[PDB]
């Protein structure tokens, strides 16, 4: 199997199990109080979202690699409701995004490849496809 | 013309029309019945190109209304398909048969049109062609649904289903059928 044959919305939840099982990457001292972007009005209801956020950005590296802070901040964006004035687009947080990438470095998941863009190690890909063999084996559309 | 007509969830066949006056306009087998209600975008070119869309498709098109909702079609497709599950649960028979006997039951037989009768432009009761009777009800029933679910807790697939299922056995209860007679009643009051 491969990531390109399974449900992505449940896939990120699946990997959110894995980083809870490893449970040693890092969890920043500020996970309590940050907002995950500059446009939201309320921090996430789920307090264990770092397993979720790091499930996404690591997953997106599998499909559009060479991505740094920007290509991860660009995906994390939506309406920036200034209220009376019309809404807009506003990129997500910078520092919160990179701390994921550094934490993956310690776990050796991702690496900085040529062109200075984060890519994925050949052992790093093993983890991403391995869990795919589990969701696929337990779900047929 | 596939192996058999089917929604994948319901089946189109055996949906009968209780008027000889609404076939060729209540379209359930034009030459077919589409698996999923969503247009190709051809229609609305000549005045009778509008009577070749599936009745479900046009009702899907009329759920978008009143500002914030406008232009969101895939959201209605979700409502309509769910709303047919709900009708099939309360009463049974294929909701097409519910909808068909419902959209019949909400279009008036008459209207009061302005015309010269008594020197000034009066109102003389007139007759309504089949297209204007299917077209009136279809946007009339949405009006009941949109009004009903505007402040209730009820889910939309509930109120729309609850409103239609009244009409197939219409008893002066569904907002559309409440209007339908009142359109005729005032029409017969002046001639």
């Amino acid at each position: 199997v491969t990531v390109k044959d399974v449900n992505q919305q449940e896939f990120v939840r699946a990997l959110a199990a894995f980083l809870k099982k490893s449970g040693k990457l890092k969890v920043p001292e500020w996970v309590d109080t940050v907002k995950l972007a500059k446009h939201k009005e309320l921090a996430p209801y789920d307090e264990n979202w770092f397993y979720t956020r790091a499930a996404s950005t690591a997953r997106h590296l599998y499909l559009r690699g060479g991505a740094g802070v920007g290509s991860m901040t660009k995906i994390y964006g939506g309406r920036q409701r200034n209220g009376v004035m019309p809404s807009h687009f506003s990129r997500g947080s910078k520092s919160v995004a990179r701390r994921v990438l550094q934490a993956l470095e310690g776990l050796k998941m991702v690496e900085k490849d040529q062109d200075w863009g984060r890519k994925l190690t050949p052992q790093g890909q093993r983890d991403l496809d391995r869990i795919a063999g589990q969701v696929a084996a337990a779900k047929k559309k | 013309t596939p192996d058999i007509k089917l929604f994948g969830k319901w089946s189109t066949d055996d949906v009968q029309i209780n008027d000889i006056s609404l076939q060729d306009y209540i379209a359930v087998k034009e030459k077919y019945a589409k698996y999923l209600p969503h247009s190709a975008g051809r229609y609305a070119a000549k005045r009778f190109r509008k009577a070749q869309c599936p009745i479900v498709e046009r009702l899907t098109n009329s759920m978008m209304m009143h500002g914030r909702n406008n232009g969101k079609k895939l959201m209605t497709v979700r409502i309509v398909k769910h709303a047919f599950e709900i009708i099939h649960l309360l009463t049974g028979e294929n909701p097409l048969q519910v909808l068909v006997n419902a959209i019949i039951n909400s279009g008036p037989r008459e209207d009061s049109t302005r015309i010269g009768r008594a020197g000034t432009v009066r109102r003389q009761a007139v007759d309504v062609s089949p297209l204007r009777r299917v077209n009136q009800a279809i946007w009339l029933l949405c009006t009941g649904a949109r009004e009903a679910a505007f402040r209730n807790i009820k889910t939309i697939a509930e109120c729309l289903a609850d409103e239609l299922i009244n009409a197939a056995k219409g008893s002066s209860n569904s907002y559309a059928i409440k209007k339908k007679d009142e359109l005729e009643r005032v029409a017969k009051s002046n001639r």
């Binding site: - | 599950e85 709900i86 309360l90 807790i153 889910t155």
Partner: protein, 75 residues
């Protein structure tokens, strides 16, 4: 305007009030429960979540804006 008094709790009397009746409903949705009772959906969606766990009510469609349940084939 007038309150609806949709409460935020149970009382061991209204709860078993629910436990006999609804599995004979052909239409089991969070909306119809709160029409029948003077209860918020939050409890009822949870109460149906409570009742769904027992097995007295079965599943037709669990969707973001609405969920559908039916009878347990009583007869």
């Amino acid at each position: 305007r007038d309150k609806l008094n949709n409460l935020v709790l149970f009382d061991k009397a209204t709860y078993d009030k629910l436990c006999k009746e609804v599995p004979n409903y052909k239409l089991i949705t969070p909306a119809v429960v709160s029409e029948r009772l003077k209860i918020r959906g939050s409890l009822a969606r949870a109460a149906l979540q409570e009742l769904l766990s027992k097995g007295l009510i079965k599943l037709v469609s669990k969707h973001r804006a609405q969920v559908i349940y039916t009878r347990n084939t009583k007869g």
